[PDB]
Design an enzyme around this catalytic site. Structure first.
Site, PDB file in Angstrom:
ATOM      1  N   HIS A   1       0.770  -1.215  -0.001  1.00 52.31           N
ATOM      2  CA  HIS A   1       0.105  -0.058   0.110  1.00 52.31           C
ATOM      3  C   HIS A   1       0.920   1.319  -0.050  1.00 52.31           C
ATOM      4  O   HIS A   1       0.306   2.383  -0.191  1.00 52.31           O
ATOM      5  CB  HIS A   1      -0.947  -0.175   1.282  1.00 52.31           C
ATOM      6  CG  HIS A   1      -1.934  -1.083   1.512  1.00 52.31           C
ATOM      7  ND1 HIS A   1      -1.528  -2.198   1.925  1.00 52.31           N
ATOM      8  CD2 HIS A   1      -3.255  -0.997   1.075  1.00 52.31           C
ATOM      9  CE1 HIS A   1      -2.812  -2.999   2.215  1.00 52.31           C
ATOM     10  NE2 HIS A   1      -3.648  -2.417   1.525  1.00 52.31           N
TER      11      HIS A   1
ATOM     12  N   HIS B   1       7.033   6.898   5.052  1.00 49.21           N
ATOM     13  CA  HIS B   1       6.555   6.526   3.826  1.00 49.21           C
ATOM     14  C   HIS B   1       5.664   7.633   3.404  1.00 49.21           C
ATOM     15  O   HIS B   1       5.654   8.771   3.960  1.00 49.21           O
ATOM     16  CB  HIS B   1       5.276   5.542   4.156  1.00 49.21           C
ATOM     17  CG  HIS B   1       4.254   6.097   5.008  1.00 49.21           C
ATOM     18  ND1 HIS B   1       4.226   5.892   6.379  1.00 49.21           N
ATOM     19  CD2 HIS B   1       3.160   6.518   4.756  1.00 49.21           C
ATOM     20  CE1 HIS B   1       3.364   6.307   7.005  1.00 49.21           C
ATOM     21  NE2 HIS B   1       2.489   6.733   5.871  1.00 49.21           N
TER      22      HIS B   1
ATOM     23  N   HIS C   1       2.335   9.239   0.881  1.00 49.64           N
ATOM     24  CA  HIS C   1       0.936   8.944  -0.092  1.00 49.64           C
ATOM     25  C   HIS C   1       1.218   9.814  -1.353  1.00 49.64           C
ATOM     26  O   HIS C   1       1.577  11.120  -1.251  1.00 49.64           O
ATOM     27  CB  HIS C   1      -0.194   9.253   0.809  1.00 49.64           C
ATOM     28  CG  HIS C   1      -0.077   8.644   1.993  1.00 49.64           C
ATOM     29  ND1 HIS C   1      -0.946   7.394   2.189  1.00 49.64           N
ATOM     30  CD2 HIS C   1       0.600   8.750   3.435  1.00 49.64           C
ATOM     31  CE1 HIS C   1      -0.740   7.137   3.537  1.00 49.64           C
ATOM     32  NE2 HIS C   1       0.144   7.954   4.174  1.00 49.64           N
TER      33      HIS C   1
ATOM     34  N   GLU D   1      -2.823  13.600   1.662  1.00 47.66           N
ATOM     35  CA  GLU D   1      -3.864  13.175   2.779  1.00 47.66           C
ATOM     36  C   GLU D   1      -4.700  14.646   3.284  1.00 47.66           C
ATOM     37  O   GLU D   1      -5.549  14.701   3.074  1.00 47.66           O
ATOM     38  CB  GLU D   1      -3.342  12.289   3.590  1.00 47.66           C
ATOM     39  CG  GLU D   1      -3.170  10.690   2.838  1.00 47.66           C
ATOM     40  CD  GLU D   1      -3.251   9.620   3.821  1.00 47.66           C
ATOM     41  OE1 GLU D   1      -2.582   9.635   4.877  1.00 47.66           O
ATOM     42  OE2 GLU D   1      -3.681   8.691   3.289  1.00 47.66           O
TER      43      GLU D   1
ATOM     44  N   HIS E   1       4.973  11.005   5.639  1.00 47.51           N
ATOM     45  CA  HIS E   1       4.813  10.762   6.900  1.00 47.51           C
ATOM     46  C   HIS E   1       5.867  10.268   7.831  1.00 47.51           C
ATOM     47  O   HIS E   1       6.367   9.178   7.516  1.00 47.51           O
ATOM     48  CB  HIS E   1       3.613   9.810   7.253  1.00 47.51           C
ATOM     49  CG  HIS E   1       2.174  10.540   6.564  1.00 47.51           C
ATOM     50  ND1 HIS E   1       1.195   9.833   6.260  1.00 47.51           N
ATOM     51  CD2 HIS E   1       1.936  11.882   6.480  1.00 47.51           C
ATOM     52  CE1 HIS E   1       0.358  10.783   5.933  1.00 47.51           C
ATOM     53  NE2 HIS E   1       0.719  11.903   6.102  1.00 47.51           N
TER      54      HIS E   1
ATOM     55  N   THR F   1      -4.078   6.936   9.573  1.00 44.93           N
ATOM     56  CA  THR F   1      -4.713   7.188   7.979  1.00 44.93           C
ATOM     57  C   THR F   1      -5.069   5.948   7.172  1.00 44.93           C
ATOM     58  O   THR F   1      -5.727   5.858   5.982  1.00 44.93           O
ATOM     59  CB  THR F   1      -4.322   8.392   7.220  1.00 44.93           C
ATOM     60  OG1 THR F   1      -3.052   7.814   6.381  1.00 44.93           O
ATOM     61  CG2 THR F   1      -4.045   9.586   8.001  1.00 44.93           C
TER      62      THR F   1
HETATM   63 ZN   LIG Z   1       0.669   7.828   5.884  1.00 43.47          ZN
END
Ligand SMILES: [Zn+2]
EC number: 4.2.1.1
Length: 256
Positions: A60, A90, A92, A102, A115, A194
């Site tokens: 993911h 990591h 997004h 996010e 993050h 999240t």
């Molecule tokens: Zn994250």
């Protein structure tokens, strides 16, 4: 769970009912309703001793994992009353430069969001920490497209080697100081992970200043796969949860 039409954020509440809870993340930061708090201390990011180990495609996102056995890479100060050790970072990102973050700012999306995930040293380890409302502190940093971020290039350069779910590469000697903007001005609010399990264990600290990354650098993120090797290609894009309702939490800022 995932990010697809049939397993994505709108479905997560069926296995993780806190998805509809009172302190979910991310959120939109409305800069008119966020409150400047002059009592908010400067953030202390101490990464000089940070010891990276490995980078892995977990299906993911990709995570860079750190040795958190000592106070080598700690976040303190700012709105925090404790010390928090870095376990992993990591990102997004989106299927185009116009989305991927996010958190949003006045409903504006950024191309990606980093993050840096830290746990509270009151609680022994990360897995104990996430059972507590103050168990984690996540430092979130927006990515916009412009000049290249030199400190990100080692990450970009290894991603071809971890294309599919379950792949990993040794990733020693990486200094996360190279991922920080000049300013540590921030917004902060109480929230959650999240992704599932969506635990409401996070103090979020979102930096005001984005980092600039080149077109080429963020494009590399979009060549990763959600799938395993030999499985039908599902490109790893749009691995972000949309903003969730603030529900009367106060977003505080270190600036007006
Ligand atoms: Zn994250």
């Amino acid at each position: 769970w995932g990010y697809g039409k049939h397993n994505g954020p709108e479905h997560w509440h069926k296995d993780f009912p806190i998805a509809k809870g009172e302190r979910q993340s991310p959120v939109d930061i409305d800069t008119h309703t966020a409150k400047y708090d002059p009592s908010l201390k400067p953030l202390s990011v101490s990464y000089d001793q940070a010891t990276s180990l490995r980078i892995l495609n977990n299906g993911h996102a990709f995570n860079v994992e750190f040795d958190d056995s000592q106070d080598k890479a700690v976040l303190k100060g700012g709105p925090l009353d404790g010390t928090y050790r870095l376990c992993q970072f990591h990102f997004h990102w989106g299927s185009l430069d116009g989305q991927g973050s996010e958190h949003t700012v006045d409903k504006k999306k950024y191309a990606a969001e980093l993050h840096l995930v830290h746990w509270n040293t009151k609680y022994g380890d990360f897995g104990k920490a996430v059972q507590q409302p103050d168990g984690l502190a996540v430092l979130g940093i927006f990515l916009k497209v412009g000049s290249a971020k030199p400190g990100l290039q080692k990450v970009v350069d290894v991603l071809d080697s971890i294309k599919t779910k379950g792949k990993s590469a040794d990733f020693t000697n990486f200094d996360p100081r190279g991922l920080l903007p000049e300013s540590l001005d921030y917004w902060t609010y109480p929230g959650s992970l999240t992704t599932p399990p969506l635990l409401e264990c996070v103090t979020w600290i979102v930096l005001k200043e984005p980092i600039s990354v080149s077109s080429e650098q963020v494009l590399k993120f979009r060549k990763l796969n959600f799938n395993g090797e030999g499985e039908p290609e599902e490109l790893m894009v749009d691995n972000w949860r949309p903003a969730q309702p603030l529900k009367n939490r106060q977003i505080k800022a270190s600036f007006k």
